Amino acid sequence: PTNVPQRVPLPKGFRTTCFDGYELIFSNDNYTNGVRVAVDAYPYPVGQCRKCPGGTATMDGYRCIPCPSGYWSNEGARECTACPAGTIAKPAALTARAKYSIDPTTYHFVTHLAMGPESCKKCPKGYFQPNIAGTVCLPCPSGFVSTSGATGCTACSEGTYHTDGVGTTTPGEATSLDTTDTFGSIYPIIPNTCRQCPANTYLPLRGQAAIASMNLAAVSSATPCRPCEDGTWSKAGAAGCQ
Numbered sequence: 001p002t003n004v005p006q007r008v009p010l011p012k013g014f015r016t017t018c019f020d021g022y023e024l025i026f027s028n029d030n031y032t033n034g035v036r037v038a039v040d041a042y043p044y045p046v047g048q049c050r051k052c053p054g055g056t057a058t059m060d061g062y063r064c065i066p067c068p069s070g071y072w073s074n075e076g077a078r079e080c081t082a083c084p085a086g087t088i089a090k091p092a093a094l095t096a097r098a099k100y101s102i103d104p105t106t107y108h109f110v111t112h113l114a115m116g117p118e119s120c121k122k123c124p125k126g127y128f129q130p131n132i133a134g135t136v137c138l139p140c141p142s143g144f145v146s147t148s149g150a151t152g153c154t155a156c157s158e159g160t161y162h163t164d165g166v167g168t169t170t171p172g173e174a175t176s177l178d179t180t181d182t183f184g185s186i187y188p189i190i191p192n193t194c195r196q197c198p199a200n201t202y203l204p205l206r207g208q209a210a211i212a213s214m215n216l217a218a219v220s221s222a223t224p225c226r227p228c229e230d231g232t233w234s235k236a237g238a239a240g241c242q
């Protein structure tokens with residue numbers, strides 16, 4: 001790593017060890033509290049301190065380390081802060097400098113940054129982020145259903161099974177706004193509805209989902225609703241044919 005130099009004589013304002021939250025730069029302009037207030041205030045270039053660009057943190061002060069995935073930070077942060085449970089740290093895409101005469105934001109190899117607290121974006125319906133500093137919206141296990149930004153999903157009831165709810169009164173499916181606009185195409189819409197078993201069929205298991213075959217031409221998707229034993233009948237709903 002970098003080695004701090006000895007107490008060599010230096011001109012006034014020649015910082016060699018930046019404060020916590022800033023980084024070392026090499027310029028002759030005036031820099032106070034990490035933001036320039038005057039241009040070319042020194043006869044020669046001088047080592048000075050500049051605030052971290054936000055979304056990055058440092059303790060050494062020799063480099064604005066980008067925040068690790070799942071975290072975020074503001075400008076001049078000494079340590080990143082983790083996104084809460086049920087949220088994912090989505091880094092905001094940056095635009096590279098159009099010209100070299102423009103003041104840069106961060107290093108050229110850094111293209112994404114978690115600029116602010118609002119970068120913590122909730123997992124869509126059907127997903128769940130179960131721990132702090134999460135990195136991926138985990139798809140909910142088959143048979144269970146989740147709400148927006150849930151820290152775990154609950155299973156469907158006895159008489160119902162997990163499937164899509166397009167036709168039902170209250171579709172639990174996440175909207176396109178919080179799937180393909182908040183995120184990219186990484187998290188599509190997942191069925192997270194509980195539909196009751198049809199008439200004369202019963203389902204005595206707690207967590208059940210409608211098995212779906214991706215090759216609809218050969219094998220059609222089927223539901224786990226067990227038929228009632230001959231001689232017994234059941235209304236459209238819970239288990240236990242009478």
Ligand SMILES: *[C@@H]1O[C@H](CO)[C@@H](O[C@@H]2O[C@H](CO)[C@@H](O)[C@H](O)[C@H]2NC(C)=O)[C@H](O)[C@H]1NC(C)=O
Nearest residue numbers: 012013029030031032033036037038040041042
């Ligand atoms: C760089 O800018 C700082 C901040 O404006 C200057 O510090 C000021 O100096 C004047 C003159 O002594 C004081 O009256 C102000 O109170 C200072 N401001 C602050 C915020 O401390 C500084 O003089 C400028 N030039 C250099 C060479 O550092």
